[PDB]
From a paper:
The stringent response enables bacteria to respond to nutrient limitation and other stress conditions through production of the nucleotide-based second messengers ppGpp and pppGpp, collectively known as (p)ppGpp. Here, we report that (p)ppGpp inhibits the signal recognition particle (SRP)-dependent protein targeting pathway, which is essential for membrane protein biogenesis and protein secretion. More specifically, (p)ppGpp binds to the SRP GTPases Ffh and FtsY, and inhibits the formation of the SRP receptor-targeting complex, which is central for the coordinated binding of the translating ribosome to the SecYEG translocon. Briefly, SRP recognizes hydrophobic signal sequences in the context of translating ribosomes, and SRP bound to ribosome-nascent chain complexes (RNCs) in turn interacts in a GTP-dependent manner with its receptor FtsY, also a GTPase, which localizes at the cytoplasmic membrane periphery of bacteria via a membrane-targeting sequence.
Numbering used by the authors:
A (entry chain B): 194 to 496
B (entry chain A): 194 to 495
The structure:
């Protein structure tokens, strides 16, 4: 769905990756120099050191068994190698059948986490589910009020406490109120300060502990939001949160507005954590369920 | 396919748009007066305020960097500018490989929903797919009876219940019967009264929720049917349905018999929702897959 808009949103990434490789292979023979030029181009596009070597090695071996001499035929092999990486993390989120389904949202500030919560909320509401938000980012007084106003405007209940309250208590109350009110989906926001890395990770563990007192299956999803325009910073952030709490899903925002599109391959390859959604714009449908076949087609389409 | 017929069917729109711009540019120089005359002509045709101002803006910018002086050289730039709007929403519906593929048809009464469902159902049958309909407009008994009669004539199963039944229950039963009978495509009609006591948007949300208890992928398509004759009312309807349920597709009916063909440009620019089908007549093949390149060629042909 919205395939054309996904192609348009990858325009800047497509200068270097996917269809941006056609110019490199044009009128050329398969020589080590092309593989070395291909290798710079992937590294420039933020595909990542380990992921690039795997692509170059698999491409090189792949073109040898198939006796290819023309560089243009590498395009097909490159498309399937990079689709293979993304296909391993294609697994859309299913939030049905729980009372409530609890989504704990983790990430650093500025990556677009609250924006992501808002769009998910609206999308779930469009499907006939009731939704409830927990303002677990308790020390940022402004953000908490922004969120409550947004709930008012959108008829979505937002559970909150005074500034500086315990994050686990707020989220504890939200689960109580959500079970009482027959909510299908609870989404909890969290703090995004990694300045003291030990403090946030310990806070997030306290939240999960408290949640398990109420439902031993909660959180049903631990989801990370990372920003594709921060390059390898997203890779690093994913590593910290995965080790500390155990991510079950990733949302990658802002693929529009960046020539750094390779980062999706790097997070897909290093971690194998299902990528649930990609953000490609400011519309609610811009938060799209990630499908690897469509992404690869949009990226490699020959405009 | 049927390009000649698509052209004839646009003939009333072509007086103002496309080939109807040839007269405005004939023997004229590029000046503010021409751009102002072009702007009003687009507005008279229902192209839309925002969309017309994007057209006039790029078209002014493009003619300056290229240093154009003759007005009849704007025809080519205008063709391209308008074809770019429509190319962003060119994306045909593909209903293959599901068991069943579920289409949810939404829209207000009178726009052509039931006719659209009938032609789609026939076209899918011609392609060797099996089709089933759900009569989800429960309160309208005469429509429920006519759809059942249409099914018997066309050998297409129709799932219905008693007058006033729960639409979400009718839809639930149709998805179960489609699964038991290996149906490839299930098309669900819905109520179309925007009166508040009807509670249509809540009714539509309940349908989608019931669908997900049986297949979390359903509905595979949420398609709005709107009418080109309604002018901006079609844009207003698109906004109401899109905010409430989320549209994945748009069928624009009744391009024939209207000089307001600008609505297709307005809907395309404002929403970016793919236009799966265009209705240009009373025949089965007059519900056509929308292809932007052909549409622009027929609109701008001499
Ligand atoms: N282009 C694009 N932008 C996105 C996307 N997702 C989020 N953003 C932007 O990311 C910025 C930060 O969003 P938040 O959700 O507030 O970020 P977080 O800090 O993670 O949340 P927090 O509130 O701290 O929990 C906002 O821009 P500002 O509010 O700063 O700008 P503008 O003023 O122009 O709207 C969003 O518009 C996306 O998919 N595409
Ligand atoms: N010219 C043209 N007409 C179309 C097209 N699509 C639909 N129509 C007509 O628009 C009218 C709407 O018919 P319906 O399908 O009942 O529309 P909706 O009311 O939206 O469906 P609903 O039944 O409420 O779900 C019908 O004419 P009447 O109701 O007057 O006929 P008559 O009344 O004699 O049939 C159709 O023939 C089209 O592409 N081109």
């Amino acid at each position: 769905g919205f395939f054309a808009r996904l192609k348009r949103s990858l325009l800047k990434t497509k200068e270097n990756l996917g269809s941006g490789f056609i110019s490199l292979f044009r009128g050329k023979k398969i020589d080590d120099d092309l593989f070395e030029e291909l290798e710079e181009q992937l590294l420039i596009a933020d595909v990542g050191v380990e992921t690039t070597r795997k692509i170059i090695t698999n491409l090189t071996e792949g073109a040898s068994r198939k006796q290819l001499r023309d560089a243009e035929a590498l395009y097909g092999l490159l498309k399937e190698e990079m689709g293979e990486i993304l296909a391993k993390v294609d697994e859309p989120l299913n939030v049905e059948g729980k009372t409530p389904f609890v989504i704990l949202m983790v990430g650093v500030n500025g990556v677009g986490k609250t924006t992501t919560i808002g769009k998910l909320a609206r999308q779930f509401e469009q499907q006939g589910k009731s939704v409830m938000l927990a303002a677990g980012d308790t020390f940022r007084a402004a953000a908490v009020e922004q969120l409550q106003v947004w709930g008012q405007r959108n008829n979505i209940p937002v559970i909150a406490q005074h500034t500086g309250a315990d994050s686990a208590s707020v989220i504890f109350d939200a689960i109580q109120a959500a079970k009482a009110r027959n909510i299908d989906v609870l989404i909890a926001d969290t703090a995004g300060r990694l300045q003291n890395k030990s403090h946030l990770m310990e806070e997030l563990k306290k939240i999960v502990r408290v949640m398990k007192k109420l439902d031993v299956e909660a959180p049903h999803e631990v989801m990370l939001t990372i920003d594709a325009s921060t390059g390898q910073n997203a890779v690093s952030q994913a590593k910290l949160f995965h080790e500390a709490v155990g991510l079950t899903g990733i949302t990658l925002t802002k693929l529009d507005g960046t020539a750094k599109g390779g980062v999706i391959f790097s997070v897909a390859d290093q971690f194998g954590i299902p990528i649930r959604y990609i953000g490609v714009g400011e519309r609610i449908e811009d938060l799209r369920p990630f499908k690897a076949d469509d992404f690869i087609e949009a990226l490699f389409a020959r405009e």
